[model samples]
Target: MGQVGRQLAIIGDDINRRYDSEFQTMLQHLQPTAENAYEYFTKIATSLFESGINWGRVVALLGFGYRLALHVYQHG
Candidate 1:
């Protein structure tokens, strides 16, 4: 792989590791409700739609929003 490809591979690996860890943590805390899980994840997905925004800002915003949403469950 070239430099870009190598970088992407490393990033992808890190992302997968973090994703798995977070998934397990969420599963441990939250009840096994697919609907609620989907809603929570969709909120994260929405953060990815930050059109024309800088990636660093988008990441920071998404991290803040994720923490906020995880704690506030309007469904309950």
Candidate 2:
């Protein structure tokens, strides 16, 4: 349990190795509807897994979910 927890901590720094400024710009257009948030998260996870199923992609899925949920929460 301890080792797995440590690895999960590493995932944060692993993802920060790359930054997407242009993609971040596009995030402004994301929808806040509860239904759309789920749909968007689902499709992104599905697509990421389909292409490579690597650690970086997996991290983004979790990261995206966090931001999307936070955005919806704030607008609520």
Candidate 3:
């Protein structure tokens, strides 16, 4: 892989690791219900929104939103 591909691979790995960790942590703390799931994701979205507006942040938030929606669909 070239530099960009290598960078993306590293980022993808980090995202996967963090996602699993965060999901597990949330599972321990929150009830596994659709309402709770939506609230949890909404909290993340709100935090990301409060981080300030930028192209990169917006893209990151969108990526997070997509993943959150998929997770909720699968497990909520």
Best-performing candidate as measured by TM-score: 2
- Please give, for residues 1-76, the per-residue lDDT of candidate 1 as tens digits: 5999999999878866666456445545755353565575566557555454577556645554455455445433
Models 1 onward score TM values of 0.40, 0.61, 0.47
**Superposed model 2: Cα runs more than 4 Å off:** 1-26
Off by over 4 Å in 3: 1-33
- Decoy 3 TM-score against native: 0.47
Report the error of model 3 at residue 12, Å: 12
Give candidates' CA RMSD values in order.
8.0, 4.2, 4.0
Ranking by TM-score: 2, 3, 1
lDDT of 2 by residue, 10-76 (tens): 9655655554443444456875577687888788788879878887677667766776787777765
Comparing 2 and 3 on lDDT, the stronger one:
2
In model 2, state the lDDT of residue 15: 57
Residue-level lDDT for 25 in candidate 3 = 54
Better lDDT candidate (1, 3): 3
Q: Which ranges of candidate 1 are over 4 A from the true structure? A: 40-76
- Return the clash pairs for model 1, or none: none
